[PDB]
């Protein structure tokens, strides 16, 4: 029993149920307001397991001790830590999102700062590394997304918790997000696994960025490694400045669906964005543009894909019929 | 042993080269001298490269070297003489000869060009066979004269023939060498690569000079093959109107040769631009098709820096695309 995988999972399952209840308190008002301020109702907050970590020292820690969980289990679980005068909660006075496995089991939390006088000055904090929680592979929304990424052959990677919430509310039930870190190798590996039918990788990785310089970071990165999934990787960017949560507030659910559906392939986005910052109305600027994008096509390792982009370059700078 | 040893064989060749050099001043050698003077190689040139003439008859050199003390076993071993039906006879006859030497200037064999209409031997050029001293796949004409400046200058100019070597050296291109009888292969290449290092860490530029263009084509096809370390330090130069360096110098003078070598092109640029030269660049769709044939070639370049540099110039070489 003591400190097994399933015991820690029972503790986190217990913790999330408590924090859920705590969102229905008087001091948790600013957490609820944060939610309604960006159009997430009580049905939504419940669907994503949204909770509140209350003030005080050890509200959760005592709760789980009083229902049989020893403190050593809770430390390895990541829910509690050792203070000067005994045990205390890890999370205090924050809006919490439970972070789940693909099966739906809670393995940790992401926690947003609400109050200006809270000692922890970081905007987001997470559960640290545990037997359950692994920063590099864990994804918010993956529990709600799993069935629909396999059926639709599609995963949609967004930046934050409220972006997943907004996407799923607007019918983009394939949206997921890395928690407290960059989206990386083993997040890709896990989505890749879900999108196998037989031994073939089938589907699309649609990255949704916000602020076009964050999108240009991924573009200049797109030729770097072995380019494994580059051919099936796509980009969607909101009307400049905006993110999925904001785009939904202004323009509604349908604007999000259309943002995802009108995604551009990753190489095409990289090449054309580099053509965009150039003068295409003279022979000189024509020439300069090719001088910088022919090398980009040069780096595409897949010869089918390289030829496809090489074919279209002249058309894009204006030298030929598109 | 005493008889048939390496230095004995070298001494035989040196004696044979002196004999043949003297025989170039004879009456019957006029057409050999006329071969040289007809392409502007003076008496100083002929003496510089050790030019000689193999005389008429059967055993003229053999008998000369037998008076000097050499056994027939040794002259057969050195590739100077062979066993005929009524006795020992010379390998070469009635031909203009160039001694082929090691990089230290020791004669290891000869290249013999046909001079007469009624020459029993039809081949335009004949060489010493494989002996203890002469290996066709590692021997090079000019290497004794070019050794120093190939090492110091980190440059070797590979030309096809003996007169091309002579023409290059007379024009001041002192890094010119050539293979003898056969094609320039791996051992010639690895030797020149080594030499240009100057007992150090230097990359040196290898410059191929081709007569026509099928050789240029052949070099172009090979450019991307395998690991491509010394393709990136290789260069190509071609003369106008399908002339060898010798004739280039005849018509257009020494300056043409010095600037043939100066205006040489990297092997990758040569290959790429040779592919572009077969395509119609006059229309916009032809520009695009040209671009489409070239990015695969550029993509074959393994070195990421070269690939990018060639990729950057592709628009210009197609006519702006
Ligand atoms: Sr000729």
Coordinates of C-alpha atoms and ligand atoms in Angstrom, one line a residue:
Chain A
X1 CA 0.0 0.0 0.0
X2 CA 2.3 2.8 1.3
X3 CA 3.7 4.9 -1.5
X4 CA 2.6 2.8 -4.5
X5 CA 1.5 4.3 -7.9
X6 CA -2.2 3.7 -7.2
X7 CA -2.0 5.2 -3.6
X8 CA -0.5 8.5 -4.8
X9 CA -3.2 8.6 -7.5
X10 CA -5.8 8.1 -4.8
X11 CA -4.3 11.1 -2.9
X12 CA -4.3 13.4 -6.0
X13 CA -7.8 12.2 -6.8
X14 CA -8.8 13.2 -3.3
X15 CA -6.9 16.5 -3.5
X16 CA -8.7 17.5 -6.7
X17 CA -12.1 16.8 -5.3
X18 CA -11.3 19.0 -2.2
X19 CA -10.0 21.9 -4.4
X20 CA -13.1 21.6 -6.6
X21 CA -15.3 22.1 -3.5
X22 CA -13.0 25.0 -2.3
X23 CA -13.8 26.9 -5.5
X24 CA -17.3 27.1 -4.0
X25 CA -16.2 29.3 -1.0
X26 CA -16.3 33.0 -0.1
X27 CA -12.6 33.7 -0.4
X28 CA -12.4 31.8 -3.8
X29 CA -14.6 34.6 -5.4
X30 CA -11.6 36.1 -7.4
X31 CA -10.8 32.6 -8.9
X32 CA -14.5 32.3 -10.1
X33 CA -14.3 35.9 -11.4
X34 CA -11.1 35.0 -13.4
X35 CA -13.1 32.2 -15.0
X36 CA -16.3 34.2 -15.8
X37 CA -14.2 37.2 -16.9
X38 CA -13.1 35.0 -19.8
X39 CA -16.5 33.3 -20.4
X40 CA -16.0 29.9 -18.6
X41 CA -19.3 29.0 -16.8
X42 CA -19.9 26.7 -13.8
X43 CA -20.5 23.7 -16.1
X44 CA -17.1 24.4 -17.7
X45 CA -15.2 24.8 -14.5
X46 CA -16.6 21.5 -13.4
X47 CA -15.7 19.8 -16.7
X48 CA -12.0 20.8 -16.4
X49 CA -12.0 20.1 -12.7
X50 CA -11.2 23.7 -11.8
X51 CA -10.5 24.2 -8.1
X52 CA -9.2 26.7 -5.6
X53 CA -6.3 26.2 -3.1
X54 CA -7.5 28.0 0.0
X55 CA -5.5 30.3 2.4
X56 CA -4.0 28.9 5.6
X57 CA -1.2 26.4 6.1
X58 CA -2.4 22.8 5.9
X59 CA -6.1 22.6 4.9
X60 CA -5.5 19.9 2.3
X61 CA -2.8 18.1 4.2
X62 CA -4.9 17.6 7.3
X63 CA -7.9 16.6 5.1
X64 CA -5.9 13.7 3.5
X65 CA -4.4 12.6 6.9
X66 CA -7.9 12.5 8.4
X67 CA -8.8 10.1 5.6
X68 CA -5.8 7.8 6.1
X69 CA -3.1 9.3 3.8
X70 CA 0.3 9.4 5.6
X71 CA 2.4 12.6 5.2
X72 CA 5.3 10.6 3.4
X73 CA 2.8 9.6 0.7
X74 CA 1.7 13.2 0.3
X75 CA 5.3 14.5 0.0
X76 CA 6.1 12.0 -2.8
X77 CA 2.6 12.8 -4.3
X78 CA 3.6 16.5 -4.5
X79 CA 0.5 17.8 -2.6
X80 CA 2.3 18.7 0.7
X81 CA 5.7 19.7 1.9
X82 CA 7.6 20.0 5.2
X83 CA 7.5 23.3 7.0
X84 CA 9.2 24.6 10.1
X85 CA 6.4 23.7 12.5
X86 CA 5.3 20.5 10.6
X87 CA 3.4 19.7 7.4
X88 CA 1.9 22.3 5.0
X89 CA 0.1 22.6 1.6
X90 CA 2.2 23.2 -1.5
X91 CA -0.5 25.4 -3.1
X92 CA -2.1 28.5 -1.5
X93 CA -4.6 31.1 -2.7
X94 CA -4.5 30.1 -6.4
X95 CA -6.9 29.0 -9.1
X96 CA -6.0 25.3 -9.9
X97 CA -6.3 23.1 -12.9
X98 CA -6.0 19.4 -12.4
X99 CA -3.5 17.8 -14.8
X100 CA -4.6 14.3 -15.8
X101 CA -3.3 11.2 -17.5
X102 CA -4.9 10.2 -20.8
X103 CA -7.0 7.7 -18.8
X104 CA -8.4 10.6 -16.6
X105 CA -6.4 10.1 -13.4
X106 CA -5.0 13.2 -11.7
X107 CA -1.2 13.4 -11.5
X108 CA -0.6 17.0 -10.5
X109 CA -1.9 20.6 -10.7
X110 CA -1.2 23.9 -12.4
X111 CA -1.8 26.9 -10.2
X112 CA -2.4 30.6 -11.2
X113 CA -1.6 33.6 -9.0
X114 CA -4.7 35.6 -8.1
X115 CA -3.8 38.0 -5.3
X116 CA -1.2 40.8 -5.6
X117 CA 0.0 40.3 -1.9
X118 CA 0.8 36.5 -2.3
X119 CA 4.5 35.8 -1.4
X120 CA 4.9 33.5 -4.4
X121 CA 5.4 36.1 -7.2
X122 CA 5.5 33.6 -10.1
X123 CA 2.4 33.7 -12.4
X124 CA 2.1 29.9 -12.7
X125 CA 3.4 27.2 -10.4
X126 CA 3.1 23.4 -10.8
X127 CA 3.4 20.1 -9.0
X128 CA 7.2 19.3 -9.0
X129 CA 8.8 16.1 -10.4
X130 CA 7.2 12.9 -8.9
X131 CA 6.6 9.2 -9.7
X132 CA 3.4 10.5 -11.3
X133 CA 4.1 14.0 -12.5
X134 CA 6.6 14.5 -15.3
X135 CA 6.8 18.0 -16.6
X136 CA 8.2 16.9 -20.0
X137 CA 5.4 14.5 -20.9
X138 CA 2.3 15.8 -19.1
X139 CA -0.4 17.6 -21.0
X140 CA -3.5 19.6 -20.0
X141 CA -6.7 18.5 -21.9
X142 CA -5.2 15.2 -23.0
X143 CA -7.9 13.3 -21.1
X144 CA -10.7 15.1 -22.9
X145 CA -8.8 15.0 -26.3
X146 CA -7.6 11.4 -26.5
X147 CA -10.7 9.9 -28.3
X148 CA -11.1 12.8 -30.7
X149 CA -7.3 12.9 -31.7
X150 CA -7.5 9.2 -32.6
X151 CA -10.8 9.6 -34.5
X152 CA -10.0 12.9 -36.3
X153 CA -6.3 12.2 -36.8
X154 CA -5.6 15.6 -35.4
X155 CA -3.9 17.2 -32.4
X156 CA -4.0 20.9 -31.7
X157 CA -1.2 22.2 -29.4
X158 CA -2.0 25.5 -27.6
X159 CA 0.0 27.5 -25.0
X160 CA -2.0 27.6 -21.7
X161 CA -4.9 26.1 -19.7
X162 CA -7.5 28.7 -20.7
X163 CA -6.6 28.2 -24.4
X164 CA -7.4 24.5 -24.0
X165 CA -10.6 25.4 -22.2
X166 CA -11.6 27.9 -24.9
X167 CA -10.8 25.5 -27.8
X168 CA -12.7 22.5 -26.3
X169 CA -15.8 24.7 -25.4
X170 CA -15.8 25.9 -29.1
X171 CA -15.8 22.3 -30.3
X172 CA -12.1 21.9 -30.9
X173 CA -12.0 18.7 -28.8
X174 CA -8.5 17.8 -29.9
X175 CA -6.7 20.8 -28.2
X176 CA -3.9 20.1 -25.6
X177 CA -1.2 22.1 -23.9
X178 CA 2.2 21.5 -22.1
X179 CA 2.1 22.6 -18.5
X180 CA 4.8 25.0 -17.1
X181 CA 7.4 24.2 -19.8
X182 CA 8.0 24.2 -23.5
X183 CA 6.2 21.6 -25.8
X184 CA 9.0 19.1 -26.6
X185 CA 10.1 15.7 -27.7
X186 CA 8.1 13.4 -25.3
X187 CA 4.9 15.5 -25.7
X188 CA 5.2 14.9 -29.4
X189 CA 6.0 11.2 -28.8
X190 CA 2.8 10.7 -26.8
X191 CA 0.6 12.5 -29.4
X192 CA 2.3 10.5 -32.2
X193 CA 1.4 7.3 -30.3
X194 CA -2.3 8.2 -30.2
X195 CA -2.4 9.0 -33.9
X196 CA -1.1 5.6 -35.0
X197 CA -3.5 3.3 -36.8
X198 CA -1.6 0.1 -37.7
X199 CA 2.1 0.9 -37.7
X200 CA 1.6 4.2 -39.6
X201 CA 1.7 7.7 -38.2
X202 CA -1.5 9.4 -39.5
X203 CA -2.7 12.9 -38.9
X204 CA -1.8 16.5 -38.4
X205 CA 0.0 18.4 -35.6
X206 CA -1.5 21.9 -35.7
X207 CA 0.4 24.3 -33.5
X208 CA -1.5 27.5 -32.5
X209 CA 0.7 30.4 -31.4
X210 CA -0.2 33.9 -30.1
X211 CA 1.9 37.0 -31.0
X212 CA 3.6 36.5 -34.3
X213 CA 7.1 36.6 -32.9
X214 CA 6.3 33.5 -30.9
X215 CA 5.2 31.9 -34.2
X216 CA 8.4 33.1 -36.0
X217 CA 10.4 31.3 -33.3
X218 CA 8.9 27.9 -34.3
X219 CA 9.4 28.8 -38.0
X220 CA 13.2 29.4 -37.8
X221 CA 13.3 26.2 -35.7
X222 CA 11.3 24.2 -38.3
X223 CA 14.4 23.1 -40.3
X224 CA 16.7 22.2 -37.3
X225 CA 16.7 18.5 -36.5
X226 CA 15.8 15.4 -38.5
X227 CA 12.4 17.1 -39.4
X228 CA 10.6 13.8 -38.5
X229 CA 7.0 15.2 -38.3
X230 CA 7.6 18.5 -40.2
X231 CA 5.6 17.4 -43.2
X232 CA 2.6 16.8 -41.0
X233 CA 3.0 19.9 -38.8
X234 CA 0.9 23.0 -39.3
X235 CA 0.7 26.5 -38.0
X236 CA -2.3 28.7 -37.1
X237 CA -1.9 32.2 -35.7
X238 CA -4.7 34.5 -34.4
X239 CA -5.3 38.1 -35.6
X240 CA -2.1 39.7 -34.2
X241 CA -1.7 39.8 -30.4
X242 CA -4.6 37.3 -29.8
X243 CA -4.6 33.8 -28.3
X244 CA -7.5 31.3 -28.5
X245 CA -9.0 32.4 -25.2
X246 CA -9.1 36.1 -26.4
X247 CA -10.2 35.3 -30.0
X248 CA -13.2 33.4 -28.5
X249 CA -14.2 36.5 -26.3
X250 CA -14.1 38.9 -29.2
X251 CA -15.1 36.8 -32.2
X252 CA -16.9 33.7 -30.8
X253 CA -16.6 29.9 -31.0
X254 CA -16.7 29.8 -34.8
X255 CA -13.6 32.0 -35.1
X256 CA -11.6 29.3 -33.3
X257 CA -12.8 26.4 -35.5
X258 CA -11.9 28.5 -38.5
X259 CA -8.4 29.3 -37.1
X260 CA -7.7 25.6 -36.8
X261 CA -9.3 24.6 -40.1
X262 CA -7.3 27.2 -42.1
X263 CA -3.9 26.1 -40.8
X264 CA -0.9 26.5 -43.1
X265 CA 1.8 23.7 -43.4
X266 CA 4.9 24.4 -41.3
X267 CA 7.4 24.9 -44.1
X268 CA 5.0 27.0 -46.2
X269 CA 4.5 29.3 -43.2
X270 CA 8.3 29.6 -42.6
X271 CA 9.1 30.3 -46.3
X272 CA 6.2 32.8 -47.0
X273 CA 6.8 34.7 -43.7
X274 CA 10.4 35.2 -44.8
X275 CA 9.1 36.3 -48.2
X276 CA 6.5 38.7 -46.4
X277 CA 9.3 40.8 -44.9
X278 CA 10.7 41.6 -48.4
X279 CA 9.9 43.9 -51.4
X280 CA 8.4 41.8 -54.3
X281 CA 7.8 44.7 -56.7
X282 CA 11.2 45.0 -58.4
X283 CA 13.8 42.6 -59.9
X284 CA 16.3 43.4 -57.1
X285 CA 13.9 42.5 -54.2
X286 CA 12.7 39.5 -56.2
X287 CA 16.3 38.4 -56.4
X288 CA 17.0 39.1 -52.7
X289 CA 13.9 37.1 -51.7
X290 CA 15.0 34.0 -53.7
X291 CA 18.5 34.4 -52.3
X292 CA 17.1 33.9 -48.7
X293 CA 14.3 31.3 -49.4
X294 CA 16.1 29.0 -51.8
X295 CA 18.5 28.1 -49.0
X296 CA 15.4 27.3 -46.8
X297 CA 14.1 24.8 -49.4
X298 CA 17.7 23.5 -49.6
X299 CA 17.4 22.3 -46.0
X300 CA 14.3 20.2 -46.5
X301 CA 15.5 16.6 -46.1
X302 CA 12.4 14.9 -47.6
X303 CA 13.0 15.2 -51.4
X304 CA 9.3 15.0 -52.3
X305 CA 8.6 17.9 -50.0
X306 CA 11.6 19.9 -51.1
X307 CA 10.5 19.6 -54.8
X308 CA 7.0 20.6 -53.9
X309 CA 8.3 23.9 -52.3
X310 CA 10.9 24.5 -55.0
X311 CA 8.1 24.3 -57.6
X312 CA 6.1 27.1 -55.9
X313 CA 8.9 29.6 -55.0
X314 CA 8.9 31.6 -58.2
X315 CA 5.1 32.0 -58.0
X316 CA 5.4 33.3 -54.4
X317 CA 8.0 36.0 -55.2
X318 CA 6.0 36.9 -58.3
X319 CA 8.4 35.7 -61.1
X320 CA 6.0 33.1 -62.4
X321 CA 2.3 32.1 -62.7
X322 CA 1.0 30.9 -59.3
Chain B
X1 CA 71.6 -8.5 -54.8
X2 CA 74.4 -6.8 -56.9
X3 CA 72.6 -7.4 -60.2
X4 CA 68.9 -6.5 -60.7
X5 CA 68.5 -4.2 -57.6
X6 CA 66.5 -1.1 -57.2
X7 CA 69.3 1.5 -57.4
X8 CA 70.8 -0.5 -60.3
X9 CA 67.5 -0.3 -62.1
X10 CA 67.4 3.5 -61.4
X11 CA 70.9 3.8 -62.7
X12 CA 69.9 2.0 -65.9
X13 CA 67.0 4.4 -66.5
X14 CA 69.2 7.5 -65.8
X15 CA 71.7 6.2 -68.4
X16 CA 68.8 5.5 -70.9
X17 CA 67.5 9.0 -70.4
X18 CA 71.0 10.5 -71.1
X19 CA 71.3 8.3 -74.2
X20 CA 67.9 9.3 -75.5
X21 CA 68.6 13.0 -74.8
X22 CA 71.8 12.9 -76.8
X23 CA 69.9 11.0 -79.6
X24 CA 67.5 13.9 -80.0
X25 CA 70.3 16.0 -81.6
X26 CA 70.8 13.4 -84.4
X27 CA 69.7 13.7 -88.1
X28 CA 66.9 11.1 -87.9
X29 CA 65.4 12.9 -84.9
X30 CA 64.5 16.0 -87.0
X31 CA 60.7 15.1 -86.8
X32 CA 60.9 14.7 -83.0
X33 CA 62.5 18.2 -82.8
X34 CA 59.9 19.4 -85.3
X35 CA 57.2 18.0 -83.0
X36 CA 58.6 20.2 -80.2
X37 CA 59.4 23.3 -82.2
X38 CA 56.1 23.1 -84.1
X39 CA 54.4 23.8 -80.7
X40 CA 56.9 26.4 -79.5
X41 CA 59.1 24.3 -77.1
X42 CA 62.6 25.5 -77.6
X43 CA 65.9 23.8 -76.9
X44 CA 65.9 25.1 -73.3
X45 CA 62.5 23.5 -72.7
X46 CA 63.5 20.1 -74.2
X47 CA 66.5 20.0 -71.9
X48 CA 64.4 21.1 -68.9
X49 CA 62.0 18.1 -69.2
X50 CA 64.6 15.6 -70.4
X51 CA 63.1 15.2 -73.8
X52 CA 64.8 12.5 -76.0
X53 CA 64.4 10.4 -79.2
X54 CA 64.4 6.6 -79.4
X55 CA 66.5 5.8 -82.5
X56 CA 65.7 3.4 -85.4
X57 CA 67.1 -0.2 -85.4
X58 CA 66.7 -3.0 -82.9
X59 CA 69.1 -2.9 -79.9
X60 CA 70.8 0.5 -80.1
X61 CA 70.1 1.5 -76.4
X62 CA 70.5 -2.1 -75.2
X63 CA 74.0 -2.4 -76.7
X64 CA 74.9 1.0 -75.3
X65 CA 73.9 0.0 -71.8
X66 CA 75.6 -3.4 -72.1
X67 CA 78.9 -1.6 -72.8
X68 CA 78.2 0.4 -69.6
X69 CA 78.0 -2.9 -67.7
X70 CA 74.3 -3.6 -67.4
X71 CA 73.1 -7.3 -67.8
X72 CA 70.0 -8.0 -70.0
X73 CA 68.2 -9.3 -66.9
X74 CA 68.4 -5.8 -65.4
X75 CA 67.3 -4.0 -68.6
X76 CA 64.3 -6.3 -68.9
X77 CA 63.6 -5.7 -65.2
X78 CA 63.9 -1.9 -65.7
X79 CA 61.5 -1.9 -68.7
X80 CA 64.2 -0.7 -71.2
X81 CA 64.7 -3.9 -73.2
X82 CA 62.9 -7.1 -74.2
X83 CA 63.7 -10.6 -75.5
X84 CA 63.3 -10.8 -79.3
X85 CA 63.7 -14.0 -81.5
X86 CA 67.3 -13.2 -82.7
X87 CA 68.3 -11.5 -79.4
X88 CA 67.7 -8.5 -77.0
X89 CA 65.9 -5.5 -78.5
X90 CA 64.8 -2.0 -77.3
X91 CA 61.3 -1.3 -76.0
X92 CA 60.9 2.0 -77.8
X93 CA 61.7 2.9 -81.5
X94 CA 61.6 6.0 -83.7
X95 CA 59.6 8.0 -81.1
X96 CA 59.8 11.2 -79.1
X97 CA 60.3 10.3 -75.4
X98 CA 59.6 12.0 -72.1
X99 CA 61.3 10.5 -69.0
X100 CA 58.7 9.9 -66.2
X101 CA 60.3 10.7 -62.7
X102 CA 59.7 10.4 -59.0
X103 CA 59.1 13.6 -57.0
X104 CA 62.9 13.4 -56.2
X105 CA 63.7 13.5 -60.0
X106 CA 64.8 9.9 -60.4
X107 CA 63.8 8.4 -63.8
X108 CA 61.4 5.4 -63.4
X109 CA 60.2 5.0 -67.1
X110 CA 59.2 6.8 -70.3
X111 CA 56.3 8.1 -72.4
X112 CA 56.8 7.7 -76.1
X113 CA 54.8 9.5 -78.8
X114 CA 54.4 8.0 -82.3
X115 CA 56.3 10.0 -85.0
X116 CA 56.2 8.1 -88.3
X117 CA 53.5 7.0 -90.7
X118 CA 55.1 3.5 -91.0
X119 CA 55.6 3.0 -87.2
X120 CA 54.9 -0.7 -86.5
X121 CA 53.2 0.5 -83.3
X122 CA 49.8 2.1 -84.0
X123 CA 49.2 3.5 -80.5
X124 CA 49.7 7.3 -80.3
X125 CA 51.4 6.9 -76.9
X126 CA 53.3 4.0 -75.4
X127 CA 54.7 3.7 -71.8
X128 CA 57.0 1.6 -69.8
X129 CA 55.2 -1.5 -68.5
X130 CA 54.7 -2.3 -64.8
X131 CA 58.1 -2.8 -63.3
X132 CA 59.7 -2.6 -59.7
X133 CA 60.0 1.2 -60.3
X134 CA 57.1 2.2 -62.5
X135 CA 53.5 1.9 -61.3
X136 CA 51.1 3.6 -63.8
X137 CA 48.5 4.3 -61.2
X138 CA 50.9 6.4 -59.0
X139 CA 53.4 7.9 -61.6
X140 CA 53.0 11.5 -62.7
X141 CA 54.7 13.7 -65.3
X142 CA 55.9 17.0 -63.9
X143 CA 56.0 15.9 -60.2
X144 CA 59.8 16.5 -59.8
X145 CA 59.4 20.1 -61.2
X146 CA 56.1 20.9 -59.4
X147 CA 56.8 19.2 -56.0
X148 CA 58.0 22.4 -54.2
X149 CA 55.2 24.8 -55.4
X150 CA 52.5 22.3 -54.9
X151 CA 53.4 22.0 -51.2
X152 CA 54.2 25.7 -50.6
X153 CA 51.3 27.0 -52.8
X154 CA 48.7 24.4 -51.8
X155 CA 47.7 24.0 -55.4
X156 CA 48.1 21.3 -58.1
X157 CA 47.0 21.8 -61.7
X158 CA 46.0 18.5 -63.3
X159 CA 46.3 18.4 -67.1
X160 CA 45.8 15.5 -69.5
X161 CA 49.2 15.2 -71.3
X162 CA 53.0 15.8 -71.4
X163 CA 52.8 18.8 -73.7
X164 CA 50.1 20.4 -71.5
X165 CA 52.5 20.0 -68.6
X166 CA 55.3 21.6 -70.6
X167 CA 53.1 24.4 -71.8
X168 CA 51.9 25.1 -68.2
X169 CA 55.4 25.2 -66.7
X170 CA 56.7 27.5 -69.5
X171 CA 53.7 29.8 -68.9
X172 CA 54.7 30.0 -65.2
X173 CA 52.0 27.6 -63.8
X174 CA 54.6 25.5 -61.9
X175 CA 52.1 23.3 -60.1
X176 CA 51.0 21.4 -63.3
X177 CA 51.2 17.6 -63.4
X178 CA 49.7 14.8 -65.5
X179 CA 49.0 11.1 -65.4
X180 CA 50.8 8.9 -67.9
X181 CA 49.1 6.4 -70.2
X182 CA 46.0 5.9 -67.9
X183 CA 43.4 8.0 -66.2
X184 CA 44.0 10.1 -63.1
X185 CA 42.8 7.9 -60.2
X186 CA 42.8 7.5 -56.4
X187 CA 46.5 7.2 -55.7
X188 CA 47.4 10.2 -57.8
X189 CA 44.8 12.2 -55.9
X190 CA 45.8 11.0 -52.4
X191 CA 49.4 11.8 -53.2
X192 CA 48.6 15.4 -54.4
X193 CA 46.2 15.9 -51.4
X194 CA 49.1 14.9 -49.1
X195 CA 51.7 17.0 -50.8
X196 CA 49.5 20.2 -50.6
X197 CA 49.2 19.7 -46.8
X198 CA 52.9 21.0 -46.6
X199 CA 53.6 18.6 -43.7
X200 CA 50.8 20.4 -41.9
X201 CA 47.0 21.1 -41.9
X202 CA 46.5 22.9 -45.2
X203 CA 43.6 22.4 -47.5
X204 CA 44.8 23.0 -51.1
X205 CA 42.9 23.6 -54.3
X206 CA 43.0 20.8 -56.9
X207 CA 42.5 22.2 -60.4
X208 CA 41.4 19.9 -63.2
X209 CA 42.0 21.2 -66.7
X210 CA 40.1 19.4 -69.4
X211 CA 40.5 19.4 -73.3
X212 CA 36.9 19.2 -74.5
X213 CA 33.8 18.6 -72.3
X214 CA 33.0 14.9 -71.9
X215 CA 35.8 14.9 -69.4
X216 CA 34.2 17.9 -67.7
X217 CA 30.9 16.0 -67.8
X218 CA 32.5 12.9 -66.3
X219 CA 34.0 15.0 -63.5
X220 CA 30.7 16.7 -63.0
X221 CA 28.7 13.4 -62.5
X222 CA 31.2 12.1 -59.9
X223 CA 31.2 15.4 -57.9
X224 CA 28.5 14.4 -55.4
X225 CA 29.4 10.7 -55.0
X226 CA 29.9 9.3 -51.5
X227 CA 31.5 11.3 -48.8
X228 CA 32.6 14.4 -50.6
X229 CA 35.5 15.9 -48.7
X230 CA 37.9 16.7 -51.6
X231 CA 35.1 17.5 -54.1
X232 CA 34.7 20.7 -52.1
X233 CA 38.5 21.5 -52.7
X234 CA 38.3 20.5 -56.4
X235 CA 38.1 23.0 -59.3
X236 CA 37.6 22.8 -63.0
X237 CA 39.0 25.0 -65.9
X238 CA 38.2 24.5 -69.6
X239 CA 39.8 26.2 -72.6
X240 CA 37.7 27.9 -75.3
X241 CA 36.9 26.0 -78.5
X242 CA 38.0 22.5 -77.3
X243 CA 41.8 23.1 -77.2
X244 CA 44.4 21.5 -74.9
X245 CA 46.7 23.9 -72.8
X246 CA 49.5 23.3 -75.3
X247 CA 47.5 24.6 -78.3
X248 CA 45.9 27.3 -76.1
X249 CA 49.4 28.7 -75.5
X250 CA 50.3 28.4 -79.3
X251 CA 47.4 30.6 -80.5
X252 CA 46.5 32.9 -77.5
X253 CA 49.9 33.0 -75.7
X254 CA 51.2 32.3 -72.1
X255 CA 48.7 34.8 -70.5
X256 CA 45.8 32.6 -71.6
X257 CA 47.2 29.7 -69.6
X258 CA 47.8 31.8 -66.4
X259 CA 44.2 33.1 -66.5
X260 CA 42.7 29.7 -67.5
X261 CA 43.9 28.6 -64.1
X262 CA 42.8 31.9 -62.4
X263 CA 39.3 31.7 -63.8
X264 CA 38.7 28.1 -62.6
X265 CA 35.4 27.2 -61.1
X266 CA 34.6 25.1 -58.0
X267 CA 33.6 21.5 -58.9
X268 CA 30.1 21.9 -57.5
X269 CA 29.4 25.2 -59.3
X270 CA 30.7 23.6 -62.5
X271 CA 28.3 20.6 -62.2
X272 CA 25.3 22.8 -61.3
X273 CA 26.0 25.3 -64.1
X274 CA 26.6 22.5 -66.7
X275 CA 23.1 21.1 -65.9
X276 CA 21.7 24.7 -66.3
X277 CA 23.5 25.1 -69.7
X278 CA 21.3 22.4 -71.2
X279 CA 18.0 24.1 -70.4
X280 CA 16.0 27.0 -72.0
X281 CA 16.3 30.0 -69.7
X282 CA 14.4 32.4 -72.1
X283 CA 10.9 31.8 -70.6
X284 CA 9.7 32.1 -67.0
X285 CA 8.5 28.4 -66.8
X286 CA 12.0 27.4 -68.1
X287 CA 13.6 29.4 -65.3
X288 CA 11.3 27.5 -62.8
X289 CA 12.2 24.1 -64.4
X290 CA 15.9 25.0 -64.2
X291 CA 15.4 25.8 -60.5
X292 CA 13.6 22.5 -60.1
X293 CA 16.5 20.5 -61.6
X294 CA 19.1 22.3 -59.4
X295 CA 17.7 22.2 -55.8
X296 CA 18.0 18.4 -55.9
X297 CA 21.7 18.7 -56.8
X298 CA 22.3 21.4 -54.2
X299 CA 20.5 19.1 -51.7
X300 CA 23.0 16.3 -52.5
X301 CA 25.7 18.6 -51.0
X302 CA 26.4 17.2 -47.5
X303 CA 28.3 20.1 -46.1
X304 CA 25.7 22.5 -44.7
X305 CA 27.8 25.6 -45.4
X306 CA 28.5 24.9 -49.1
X307 CA 24.9 23.8 -49.6
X308 CA 23.7 27.2 -48.4
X309 CA 26.3 29.1 -50.4
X310 CA 25.4 27.3 -53.6
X311 CA 21.6 27.6 -52.9
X312 CA 22.1 31.4 -52.5
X313 CA 23.5 31.7 -56.0
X314 CA 21.0 29.5 -57.8
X315 CA 18.6 32.4 -58.6
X316 CA 21.4 34.2 -60.4
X317 CA 22.6 31.2 -62.3
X318 CA 19.1 30.5 -63.7
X319 CA 18.8 34.2 -64.8
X320 CA 16.9 35.5 -61.7
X321 CA 14.1 32.7 -61.8
Ligands
LIG1 SR1 46.4 18.4 -80.0

